[PDB]
Amino acid sequence: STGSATTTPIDSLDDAYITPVQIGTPAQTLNLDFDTGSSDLWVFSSETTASEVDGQTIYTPSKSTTAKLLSGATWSISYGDGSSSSGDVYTDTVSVGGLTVTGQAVESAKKVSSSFTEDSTIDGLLGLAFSTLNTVSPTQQKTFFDNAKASLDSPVFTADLGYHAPGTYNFGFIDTTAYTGSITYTAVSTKQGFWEWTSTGYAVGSGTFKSTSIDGIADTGTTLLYLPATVVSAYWAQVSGAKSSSSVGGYVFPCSATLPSFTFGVGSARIVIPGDYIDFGPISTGSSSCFGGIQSSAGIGINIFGDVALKAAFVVFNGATTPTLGFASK
Numbered sequence: 001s002t003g004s005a006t007t008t009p010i011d012s013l014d015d016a017y018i019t020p021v022q023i024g025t026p027a028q029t030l031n032l033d034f035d036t037g038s039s040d041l042w043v044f045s046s047e048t049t050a051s052e053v054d055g056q057t058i059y060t061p062s063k064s065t066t067a068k069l070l071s072g073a074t075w076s077i078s079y080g081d082g083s084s085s086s087g088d089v090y091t092d093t094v095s096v097g098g099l100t101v102t103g104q105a106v107e108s109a110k111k112v113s114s115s116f117t118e119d120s121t122i123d124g125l126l127g128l129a130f131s132t133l134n135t136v137s138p139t140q141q142k143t144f145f146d147n148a149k150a151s152l153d154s155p156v157f158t159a160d161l162g163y164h165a166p167g168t169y170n171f172g173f174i175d176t177t178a179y180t181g182s183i184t185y186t187a188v189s190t191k192q193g194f195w196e197w198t199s200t201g202y203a204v205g206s207g208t209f210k211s212t213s214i215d216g217i218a219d220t221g222t223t224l225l226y227l228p229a230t231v232v233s234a235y236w237a238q239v240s241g242a243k244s245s246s247s248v249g250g251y252v253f254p255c256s257a258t259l260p261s262f263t264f265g266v267g268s269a270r271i272v273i274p275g276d277y278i279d280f281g282p283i284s285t286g287s288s289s290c291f292g293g294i295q296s297s298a299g300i301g302i303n304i305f306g307d308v309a310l311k312a313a314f315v316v317f318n319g320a321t322t323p324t325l326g327f328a329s330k
């Protein structure tokens with residue numbers, strides 16, 4: 001079997017991408033944030049504290065003939081940005097673009113942090129990292145991808161994120177019409193539960209490529225590109241007037257500047273991020289200081305190839321017994 005669904009930016013800055021997901025019988029359609037950096041499928045629901053819901057579509061398990069409460073199971077998650085949520089667990093039927101999984105763990109939020117309440121466009125998250133990171137207790141649960149794997153034509157999914165435009169998540173097949181040239185595959189470490197890999201180096205604009213190993217994770221759930229301080233300093237040094245601002249919390253640059261591209265290595269291949277992808281607009285309405293899309297990972301503890309990098313490529317998440325990541329230009 002296969003599945004295919006369109007994913008759409010939630011705002012004019014590509015801060016996140018939402019994908020419609022059908023849950024329950026009859027179907028309740030929610031717009032979820034597909035997150036390859038986490039492994040919980042959780043949703044706003046009829047159980048969520050009423051004051052913490054502001055425009056989201058909610059899952060109502062009592063209206064689903066296939067929902068079953070998972071007795072005694074709870075979940076609680078904290079994301080690297082300080083966001084968090086928690087609740088109880090149902091199993092139900094979940095379908096993504098024609099691909100159906102029965103008995104999927106659907107984690108119903110009882111409590112969500114402020115950053116989720118204020119994001120009216122995101123009804124929940126669909127985690128696509130490895131199931132070892134799932135937070136359900138006392139019985140860990142599998143991700144949508146792990147549950148679907150056996151029935152997929154090929155144990156893969158692909159992310160084709162658009163720049164200020166819709167894109168596609170495909171399950172079970174690789175669309176050879178969606179990219180140019182060849183796909184370059186690179187090894188993955190699952191030791192931390194992430195799609196963790198090693199980039200072979202970088203270049204700034206038309207400058208010389210620097211061969212150096214950068215270990216990081218492919219994370220559709222993170223907006224920006226977070227890289228070591230040395231690399232990020234080298235990039236912003238090429239932008240006139242750019243500086244790191246402690247009050248703003250990262251590199252900013254004059255909105256009138258043109259940004260250089262950023263190249264990262266995948267084996268012997270190169271992925272080029274156009275400079276326009278790195279502009280995240282004024283730091284406040286009306287400001288002439290703009291926020292940069294490449295920031296330092298120093299405070300994080302891990303390098304993150306977020307949407308800024310992934311949307312420049314066609315990305316294959318190969319969940320074979322030895323997992324790999326594939327990158328192609330598009």
Ligand SMILES: NCc1ccc(C(F)(F)F)cc1
Pocket residue numbers: 035036037038079080081219220221222300302304
């Ligand atoms: N997108 C989920 C996510 C968020 C943060 C992190 C961090 F901070 F631990 F790297 C990993 C994964």
Ligand SMILES: NCc1ccc(C(F)(F)F)cc1
Pocket residue numbers: 016033035037038079080081083115116119122221222
């Ligand atoms: N990395 C997972 C994640 C995705 C989105 C959000 C937001 F935008 F809702 F805050 C938090 C955490």
